[PDB]
Amino acid sequence: GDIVLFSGSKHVEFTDWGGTDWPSAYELQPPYQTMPFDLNKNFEIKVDYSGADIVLIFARWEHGSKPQIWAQISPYYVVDGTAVFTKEQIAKAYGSDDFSDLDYIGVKPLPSADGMTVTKIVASYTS
Amino acid sequence: GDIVLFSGSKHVEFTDWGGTDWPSAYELQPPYQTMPFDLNKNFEIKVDYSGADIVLIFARWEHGSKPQIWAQISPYYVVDGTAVFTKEQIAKAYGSDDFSDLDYIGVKPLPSADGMTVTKIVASYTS
């Protein structure tokens, strides 16, 4: 089925890079927050958005001899104000589909004059 | 308006106390996650649930000479499978309506044989 991770009107201002921080529309940290969906299923994440281009981040912080992963992905495709990200695209960027060490999931804008607004985020299982 | 923080079918098993951990249906850590709603508005949180009694936690960890706040609140009321929590009830349990030091928001079950299932969490502004 379909899991709503957010619905409303979340605005993010971000007019240029080069500042230090990169603000988000939505974030999860799996080691610290009970999960709203199960990463082990085959899933897609769909985001209704406008105002800026959008990326999805899966990240693992550096630990020991294992490097930081910063899996920044563009949509698998966009259609009708909606970006679709798939698990198999995410796994290719993450280097595997093993999320047992995943530290961070973030939805972020690219720079724009107007800011990005997200109105809905859903996880859908395709298994 | 109304902001959907979650909708789906989130099950939490928790049959007794005395273990060390207390699992959650939903958690946010405001210092670390961009917020889906604005704590400064007058709001209520409404949760559609069944299977166990439910509480809402607002917490601040101990820092310096300021104590840990563990604002565990029962619903302001329940009606038709839905618990309602209000900002003014939360502020009374938290000791103020100043959320500038809020570390944690959690929705948790009390012990039950069957576990709790949450199907929807919404923040509504009443300002």
Side-chain angles (χ1 to χ4, degrees):
Chain A
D2 273 24
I3 300 167
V4 178
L5 302 183
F6 175 75
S7 78
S9 191
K10 169 68 162 175
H11 186 72
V12 186
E13 293 191 343
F14 182 55
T15 54
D16 48 77
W17 298 113
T20 296
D21 96 296
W22 185 4
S24 310
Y26 177 86
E27 295 176 289
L28 295 174
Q29 295 191 32
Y32 296 109
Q33 291 170 278
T34 190
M35 283 298 293
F37 72 99
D38 181 1
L39 285 159
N40 291 283
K41 298 194 60 88
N42 199 9
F43 66 82
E44 52 189 22
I45 293 171
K46 300 193 265 211
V47 183
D48 296 348
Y49 75 106
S50 68
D53 289 309
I54 193 170
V55 298
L56 177 67
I57 310 305
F58 273 46
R60 178 182 76 191
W61 312 139
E62 181 171 67
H63 307 289
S65 68
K66 299 306 288 206
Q68 173 161 270
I69 298 172
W70 185 263
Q72 180 169 317
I73 54 166
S74 56
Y76 184 39
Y77 62 92
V78 306
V79 59
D80 203 26
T82 304
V84 177
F85 302 89
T86 70
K87 178 176 185 177
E88 293 331 285
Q89 167 200 33
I90 295 163
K92 176 181 183 170
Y94 193 72
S96 70
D97 58 2
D98 178 347
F99 300 122
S100 63
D101 52 8
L102 180 64
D103 290 307
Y104 177 74
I105 296 168
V107 174
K108 296 188 182 289
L110 303 184
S112 73
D114 64 334
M116 192 173 74
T117 296
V118 169
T119 57
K120 195 172 194 176
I121 304 175
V122 299
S124 287
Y125 301 135
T126 55
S127 65
Chain B
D2 273 24
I3 300 167
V4 178
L5 302 183
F6 175 75
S7 78
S9 191
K10 169 68 162 175
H11 186 72
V12 186
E13 293 191 343
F14 182 55
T15 54
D16 48 77
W17 298 113
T20 296
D21 96 296
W22 185 4
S24 310
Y26 177 86
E27 295 176 289
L28 295 174
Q29 295 191 32
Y32 296 109
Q33 291 170 278
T34 190
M35 283 298 293
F37 72 99
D38 181 1
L39 285 159
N40 291 283
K41 298 194 60 88
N42 199 9
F43 66 82
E44 52 189 22
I45 293 171
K46 300 193 265 211
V47 183
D48 296 348
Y49 75 106
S50 68
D53 289 309
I54 193 170
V55 298
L56 177 67
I57 310 305
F58 273 46
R60 178 182 76 191
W61 312 139
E62 181 171 67
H63 307 289
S65 68
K66 299 306 288 206
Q68 173 161 270
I69 298 172
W70 185 263
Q72 180 169 317
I73 54 166
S74 56
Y76 184 39
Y77 62 92
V78 306
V79 59
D80 203 26
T82 304
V84 177
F85 302 89
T86 70
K87 178 176 185 177
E88 293 331 285
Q89 167 200 33
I90 295 163
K92 176 181 183 170
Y94 193 72
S96 70
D97 58 2
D98 178 347
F99 300 122
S100 63
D101 52 8
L102 180 64
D103 290 307
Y104 177 74
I105 296 168
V107 174
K108 296 188 182 289
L110 303 184
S112 73
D114 64 334
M116 192 173 74
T117 296
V118 169
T119 57
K120 195 172 194 176
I121 304 175
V122 299
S124 287
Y125 301 135
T126 55
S127 65

Short mmCIF file of all heavy atoms in Angstrom, two decimals, chain A residues 63-104:
data_model
loop_
_atom_site.label_atom_id
_atom_site.label_comp_id
_atom_site.label_asym_id
_atom_site.label_seq_id
_atom_site.Cartn_x
_atom_site.Cartn_y
_atom_site.Cartn_z
N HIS A 63 32.51 5.91 9.39
CA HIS A 63 32.65 5.17 10.68
C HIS A 63 33.84 4.24 10.45
O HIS A 63 33.82 3.30 9.62
CB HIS A 63 31.41 4.33 11.01
CG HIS A 63 30.00 5.07 11.00
ND1 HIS A 63 29.58 6.02 11.98
CD2 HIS A 63 28.88 4.87 10.12
CE1 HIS A 63 28.27 6.44 11.64
NE2 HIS A 63 27.86 5.74 10.48
N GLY A 64 34.88 4.37 11.27
CA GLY A 64 36.00 3.41 11.12
C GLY A 64 36.62 3.60 9.72
O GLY A 64 36.82 4.77 9.29
N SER A 65 36.87 2.46 9.02
CA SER A 65 37.47 2.47 7.70
C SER A 65 36.40 2.48 6.62
O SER A 65 36.70 2.33 5.45
CB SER A 65 38.45 1.26 7.56
OG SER A 65 37.68 0.06 7.58
N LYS A 66 35.13 2.69 7.02
CA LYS A 66 34.10 2.70 6.00
C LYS A 66 33.77 4.16 5.72
O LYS A 66 33.53 4.95 6.60
CB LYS A 66 32.85 1.95 6.34
CG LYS A 66 33.12 0.46 6.58
CD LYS A 66 33.84 -0.21 5.45
CE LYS A 66 33.04 -0.43 4.22
NZ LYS A 66 33.81 -1.62 3.66
N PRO A 67 33.76 4.53 4.43
CA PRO A 67 33.62 5.89 4.06
C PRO A 67 32.19 6.48 4.23
O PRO A 67 31.23 5.69 4.30
CB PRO A 67 33.98 5.84 2.53
CG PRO A 67 33.54 4.50 2.11
CD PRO A 67 33.93 3.62 3.25
N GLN A 68 32.14 7.75 4.26
CA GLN A 68 30.86 8.42 4.12
C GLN A 68 30.24 8.12 2.79
O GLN A 68 30.92 8.30 1.75
CB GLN A 68 31.07 9.92 4.30
CG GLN A 68 29.77 10.71 3.98
CD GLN A 68 29.79 12.13 4.59
OE1 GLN A 68 29.35 12.32 5.74
NE2 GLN A 68 30.36 13.08 3.92
N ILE A 69 28.98 7.72 2.76
CA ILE A 69 28.21 7.62 1.52
C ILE A 69 27.31 8.80 1.45
O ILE A 69 26.58 9.12 2.47
CB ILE A 69 27.35 6.36 1.49
CG1 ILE A 69 28.26 5.09 1.55
CG2 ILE A 69 26.48 6.32 0.21
CD1 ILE A 69 27.43 3.82 1.73
N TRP A 70 27.33 9.59 0.39
CA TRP A 70 26.35 10.67 0.18
C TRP A 70 25.63 10.38 -1.13
O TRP A 70 26.15 10.75 -2.25
CB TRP A 70 27.05 12.00 0.19
CG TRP A 70 26.07 13.18 0.09
CD1 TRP A 70 25.76 13.85 -1.07
CD2 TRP A 70 25.36 13.81 1.19
NE1 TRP A 70 24.88 14.89 -0.77
CE2 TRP A 70 24.61 14.88 0.56
CE3 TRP A 70 25.28 13.62 2.52
CZ2 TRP A 70 23.81 15.77 1.33
CZ3 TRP A 70 24.46 14.45 3.30
CH2 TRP A 70 23.73 15.52 2.66
N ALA A 71 24.60 9.63 -1.08
CA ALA A 71 23.85 9.05 -2.32
C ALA A 71 22.86 10.19 -2.70
O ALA A 71 21.65 10.07 -2.18
CB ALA A 71 23.31 7.75 -2.07
N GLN A 72 23.22 11.19 -3.36
CA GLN A 72 22.38 12.28 -3.82
C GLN A 72 21.77 11.83 -5.14
O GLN A 72 22.58 11.60 -6.14
CB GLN A 72 23.14 13.48 -3.93
CG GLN A 72 22.43 14.66 -4.38
CD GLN A 72 23.25 15.85 -4.20
OE1 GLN A 72 23.93 16.14 -3.24
NE2 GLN A 72 23.24 16.62 -5.29
N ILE A 73 20.48 11.74 -5.24
CA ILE A 73 19.86 11.28 -6.45
C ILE A 73 18.82 12.24 -6.91
O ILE A 73 18.01 12.81 -6.20
CB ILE A 73 19.36 9.95 -6.63
CG1 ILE A 73 18.45 9.77 -5.49
CG2 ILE A 73 20.45 8.87 -6.57
CD1 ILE A 73 17.56 8.50 -5.71
N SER A 74 18.88 12.38 -8.23
CA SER A 74 17.78 13.09 -8.93
C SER A 74 16.63 12.12 -9.09
O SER A 74 16.78 10.97 -9.01
CB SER A 74 18.31 13.64 -10.29
OG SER A 74 18.78 12.52 -10.87
N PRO A 75 15.43 12.67 -9.40
CA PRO A 75 14.28 11.75 -9.60
C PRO A 75 14.54 10.71 -10.66
O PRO A 75 15.16 11.03 -11.68
CB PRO A 75 13.21 12.77 -10.07
CG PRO A 75 13.59 14.09 -9.40
CD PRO A 75 15.07 14.08 -9.47
N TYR A 76 14.05 9.53 -10.44
CA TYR A 76 14.02 8.56 -11.53
C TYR A 76 13.27 9.20 -12.68
O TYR A 76 13.73 9.10 -13.87
CB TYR A 76 13.39 7.30 -11.04
CG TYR A 76 13.37 6.17 -12.04
CD1 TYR A 76 14.41 5.90 -12.89
CD2 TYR A 76 12.20 5.47 -12.22
CE1 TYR A 76 14.29 4.82 -13.88
CE2 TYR A 76 12.09 4.35 -13.10
CZ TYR A 76 13.11 4.12 -13.89
OH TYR A 76 12.97 3.03 -14.82
N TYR A 77 12.14 9.84 -12.44
CA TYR A 77 11.49 10.72 -13.38
C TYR A 77 10.60 11.64 -12.61
O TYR A 77 10.23 11.38 -11.44
CB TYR A 77 10.70 9.92 -14.47
CG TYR A 77 9.60 9.09 -13.88
CD1 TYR A 77 8.32 9.58 -13.75
CD2 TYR A 77 9.87 7.79 -13.43
CE1 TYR A 77 7.28 8.80 -13.21
CE2 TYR A 77 8.82 7.04 -12.85
CZ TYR A 77 7.60 7.54 -12.79
OH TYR A 77 6.55 6.77 -12.17
N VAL A 78 10.22 12.71 -13.28
CA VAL A 78 9.15 13.61 -12.83
C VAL A 78 8.00 13.51 -13.78
O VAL A 78 8.19 13.33 -15.03
CB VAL A 78 9.63 15.03 -12.58
CG1 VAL A 78 10.85 15.03 -11.59
CG2 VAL A 78 9.98 15.79 -13.77
N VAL A 79 6.80 13.67 -13.29
CA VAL A 79 5.57 13.73 -14.10
C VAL A 79 4.67 14.69 -13.41
O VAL A 79 4.56 14.63 -12.16
CB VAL A 79 4.95 12.38 -14.31
CG1 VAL A 79 4.57 11.68 -13.00
CG2 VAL A 79 3.70 12.48 -15.19
N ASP A 80 3.89 15.65 -13.98
CA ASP A 80 2.67 16.36 -13.17
C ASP A 80 2.76 16.91 -11.64
O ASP A 80 1.97 16.79 -10.77
CB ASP A 80 1.57 15.36 -13.00
CG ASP A 80 0.21 15.99 -12.77
OD1 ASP A 80 -0.05 17.16 -13.20
OD2 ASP A 80 -0.57 15.24 -12.08
N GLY A 81 3.87 17.48 -11.50
CA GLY A 81 4.37 18.10 -10.24
C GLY A 81 4.86 17.02 -9.29
O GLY A 81 4.86 17.37 -8.06
N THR A 82 5.22 15.86 -9.67
CA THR A 82 5.58 14.77 -8.79
C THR A 82 6.90 14.16 -9.16
O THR A 82 7.10 13.78 -10.36
CB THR A 82 4.51 13.64 -8.78
OG1 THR A 82 3.25 14.20 -8.43
CG2 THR A 82 4.84 12.48 -7.90
N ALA A 83 7.84 14.05 -8.27
CA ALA A 83 9.11 13.34 -8.49
C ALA A 83 9.00 11.94 -7.96
O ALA A 83 8.45 11.72 -6.81
CB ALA A 83 10.21 14.04 -7.71
N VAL A 84 9.48 10.97 -8.69
CA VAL A 84 9.47 9.56 -8.28
C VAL A 84 10.85 9.11 -8.10
O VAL A 84 11.72 9.27 -9.03
CB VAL A 84 8.71 8.72 -9.31
CG1 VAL A 84 8.78 7.26 -8.91
CG2 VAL A 84 7.30 9.22 -9.52
N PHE A 85 11.19 8.48 -6.95
CA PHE A 85 12.50 7.91 -6.67
C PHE A 85 12.28 6.42 -6.40
O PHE A 85 11.30 6.08 -5.73
CB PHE A 85 13.14 8.55 -5.44
CG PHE A 85 13.31 10.04 -5.54
CD1 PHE A 85 12.31 10.90 -5.12
CD2 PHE A 85 14.50 10.60 -6.05
CE1 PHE A 85 12.46 12.24 -5.16
CE2 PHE A 85 14.64 11.97 -6.10
CZ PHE A 85 13.64 12.79 -5.65
N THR A 86 13.06 5.54 -6.94
CA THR A 86 12.85 4.11 -6.69
C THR A 86 13.92 3.51 -5.86
O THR A 86 15.08 3.96 -5.84
CB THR A 86 12.82 3.32 -7.98
OG1 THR A 86 14.12 3.26 -8.58
CG2 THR A 86 11.83 3.97 -9.03
N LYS A 87 13.57 2.41 -5.16
CA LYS A 87 14.56 1.77 -4.36
C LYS A 87 15.75 1.29 -5.22
O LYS A 87 16.92 1.37 -4.80
CB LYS A 87 13.98 0.54 -3.62
CG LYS A 87 15.01 -0.17 -2.82
CD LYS A 87 14.35 -1.32 -2.03
CE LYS A 87 15.33 -1.96 -1.15
NZ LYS A 87 14.66 -3.05 -0.31
N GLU A 88 15.48 0.76 -6.40
CA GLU A 88 16.64 0.23 -7.11
C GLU A 88 17.55 1.46 -7.54
O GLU A 88 18.80 1.27 -7.51
CB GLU A 88 16.09 -0.54 -8.29
CG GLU A 88 15.27 -1.84 -8.03
CD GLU A 88 15.55 -2.71 -6.75
OE1 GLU A 88 16.58 -3.42 -6.73
OE2 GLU A 88 14.68 -2.79 -5.78
N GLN A 89 17.02 2.60 -7.89
CA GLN A 89 17.88 3.74 -8.17
C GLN A 89 18.68 4.17 -6.95
O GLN A 89 19.86 4.47 -6.95
CB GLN A 89 16.90 4.74 -8.68
CG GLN A 89 17.45 6.05 -8.76
CD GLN A 89 16.39 7.16 -8.79
OE1 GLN A 89 15.26 7.16 -8.23
NE2 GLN A 89 16.82 8.20 -9.44
N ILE A 90 17.99 4.19 -5.78
CA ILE A 90 18.64 4.59 -4.53
C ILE A 90 19.74 3.59 -4.24
O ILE A 90 20.84 4.03 -3.81
CB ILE A 90 17.56 4.64 -3.38
CG1 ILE A 90 16.53 5.73 -3.64
CG2 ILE A 90 18.22 4.79 -2.08
CD1 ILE A 90 15.22 5.58 -2.80
N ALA A 91 19.49 2.29 -4.33
CA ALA A 91 20.51 1.30 -4.01
C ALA A 91 21.75 1.45 -4.92
O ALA A 91 22.86 1.28 -4.41
CB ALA A 91 19.88 -0.10 -4.17
N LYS A 92 21.51 1.78 -6.18
CA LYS A 92 22.68 1.94 -7.07
C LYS A 92 23.52 3.12 -6.58
O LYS A 92 24.77 3.04 -6.53
CB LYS A 92 22.20 2.20 -8.45
CG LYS A 92 23.38 2.46 -9.38
CD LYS A 92 22.83 2.74 -10.79
CE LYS A 92 23.99 2.93 -11.78
NZ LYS A 92 23.41 2.95 -13.16
N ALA A 93 22.89 4.21 -6.18
CA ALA A 93 23.63 5.38 -5.66
C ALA A 93 24.24 5.11 -4.33
O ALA A 93 25.35 5.58 -4.00
CB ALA A 93 22.74 6.59 -5.61
N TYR A 94 23.59 4.33 -3.46
CA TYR A 94 24.08 4.00 -2.15
C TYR A 94 25.18 2.97 -2.19
O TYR A 94 25.95 2.85 -1.24
CB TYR A 94 22.88 3.54 -1.27
CG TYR A 94 23.18 3.45 0.21
CD1 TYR A 94 23.35 4.64 0.98
CD2 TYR A 94 23.23 2.27 0.87
CE1 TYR A 94 23.63 4.59 2.33
CE2 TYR A 94 23.48 2.21 2.22
CZ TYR A 94 23.67 3.38 2.94
OH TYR A 94 23.90 3.36 4.29
N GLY A 95 25.32 2.20 -3.31
CA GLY A 95 26.35 1.19 -3.44
C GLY A 95 25.83 -0.13 -3.09
O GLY A 95 26.65 -1.10 -3.25
N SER A 96 24.64 -0.31 -2.56
CA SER A 96 24.03 -1.62 -2.26
C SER A 96 22.62 -1.36 -1.83
O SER A 96 22.22 -0.24 -1.60
CB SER A 96 24.72 -2.38 -1.17
OG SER A 96 24.49 -1.74 0.10
N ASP A 97 21.87 -2.45 -1.69
CA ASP A 97 20.53 -2.32 -1.13
C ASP A 97 20.59 -2.81 0.33
O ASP A 97 19.50 -3.13 0.86
CB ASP A 97 19.41 -3.10 -1.88
CG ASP A 97 19.71 -4.58 -1.95
OD1 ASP A 97 20.71 -5.05 -1.44
OD2 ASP A 97 18.86 -5.31 -2.56
N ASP A 98 21.69 -2.78 0.98
CA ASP A 98 21.77 -3.14 2.36
C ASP A 98 21.71 -1.77 3.13
O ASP A 98 22.73 -1.06 3.22
CB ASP A 98 23.12 -3.82 2.63
CG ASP A 98 23.30 -4.19 4.04
OD1 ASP A 98 22.62 -3.80 4.94
OD2 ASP A 98 24.30 -4.92 4.32
N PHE A 99 20.54 -1.49 3.74
CA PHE A 99 20.34 -0.25 4.52
C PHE A 99 20.58 -0.44 5.95
O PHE A 99 20.16 0.39 6.78
CB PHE A 99 19.00 0.36 4.16
CG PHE A 99 18.87 0.71 2.75
CD1 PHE A 99 17.84 0.16 1.93
CD2 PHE A 99 19.77 1.63 2.08
CE1 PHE A 99 17.72 0.54 0.57
CE2 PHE A 99 19.65 1.91 0.71
CZ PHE A 99 18.66 1.35 -0.10
N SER A 100 21.31 -1.50 6.39
CA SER A 100 21.52 -1.76 7.81
C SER A 100 22.41 -0.73 8.46
O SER A 100 22.45 -0.62 9.68
CB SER A 100 22.15 -3.16 8.02
OG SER A 100 23.44 -3.20 7.41
N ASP A 101 23.12 0.11 7.66
CA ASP A 101 24.01 1.16 8.22
C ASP A 101 23.53 2.53 7.75
O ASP A 101 24.33 3.50 7.85
CB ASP A 101 25.48 0.91 7.75
CG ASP A 101 25.54 0.74 6.19
OD1 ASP A 101 24.57 0.93 5.41
OD2 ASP A 101 26.70 0.30 5.74
N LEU A 102 22.31 2.70 7.32
CA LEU A 102 21.82 3.98 6.81
C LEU A 102 21.63 5.00 7.89
O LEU A 102 20.81 4.76 8.84
CB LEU A 102 20.54 3.72 6.06
CG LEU A 102 19.87 4.97 5.45
CD1 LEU A 102 20.74 5.63 4.38
CD2 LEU A 102 18.50 4.60 4.89
N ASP A 103 22.27 6.15 7.83
CA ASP A 103 22.15 7.18 8.90
C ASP A 103 21.16 8.25 8.59
O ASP A 103 20.69 8.91 9.57
CB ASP A 103 23.54 7.79 9.15
CG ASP A 103 24.49 6.94 9.78
OD1 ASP A 103 24.13 6.39 10.87
OD2 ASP A 103 25.64 6.73 9.36
N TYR A 104 20.81 8.52 7.35
CA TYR A 104 20.10 9.75 7.04
C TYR A 104 19.36 9.60 5.74
O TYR A 104 19.95 9.09 4.73
CB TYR A 104 21.17 10.89 6.88
CG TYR A 104 20.60 12.22 6.49
CD1 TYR A 104 19.90 13.01 7.40
CD2 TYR A 104 20.73 12.70 5.16
CE1 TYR A 104 19.41 14.24 7.05
CE2 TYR A 104 20.20 13.93 4.82
CZ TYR A 104 19.58 14.69 5.77
OH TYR A 104 19.09 15.92 5.32
#
